Design a protein around this ligand. Structure first.
Ligand SMILES: [Cl-]
Ligand SMILES: [Cl-]
Ligand SMILES: [Cl-]
Ligand SMILES: [Cl-]
Ligand SMILES: [Cl-]
Ligand SMILES: [Cl-]
Ligand SMILES: [Cl-]
Ligand code: NA
Length: 129
């Protein structure tokens, strides 16, 4: 499922992303654009062996089982495929967790590089929310 900035923002809002960790709803939508491009079946194979899943490219070293990332964990207790689902309750429910973890949204690299310290609110400019 390919989301639309608005639809995603609102999607994120009802799922407790709105201001979670004090990261305003905009942030996630920006985080989204560049991790996945508002996209759910988005994946990545990083040559370390792990794979990134979901609208937020959640990496299978720490956060999801996928069965093929020798020596990893599954904090968030799900198969990485849950993250590809159109119902994002997971990408969120784990996203919540990752962000809660310690580094703040920095875990998301693209957010670090492409969203940090910028016009964020713009990513919801004039959405109906
Ligand atoms: Cl967009
Ligand atoms: Cl914002
Ligand atoms: Cl594994
Ligand atoms: Cl594999
Ligand atoms: Cl554990
Ligand atoms: Cl699992
Ligand atoms: Cl933080
Ligand atoms: Na795993």
């Amino acid at each position: 499922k390919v989301f639309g900035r608005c639809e995603l923002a609102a999607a994120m809002k009802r799922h407790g992303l709105d201001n979670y960790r004090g990261y305003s709803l905009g942030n996630w939508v920006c985080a989204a654009k560049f991790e996945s491009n508002f996209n759910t079946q988005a994946t990545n194979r990083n040559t370390d062996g792990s794979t990134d899943y979901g609208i937020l490219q959640i990496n299978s070293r720490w956060w999801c089982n996928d069965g093929r990332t020798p020596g990893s964990r599954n904090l968030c207790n799900i198969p990485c495929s849950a993250l590809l689902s159109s119902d994002i309750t997971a990408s969120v429910n784990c996203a919540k967790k990752i962000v809660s973890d310690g580094n703040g949204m920095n875990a998301w690299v693209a957010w670090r590089n492409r969203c940090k310290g910028t016009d964020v609110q713009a990513w919801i400019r004039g959405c109906r929310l």
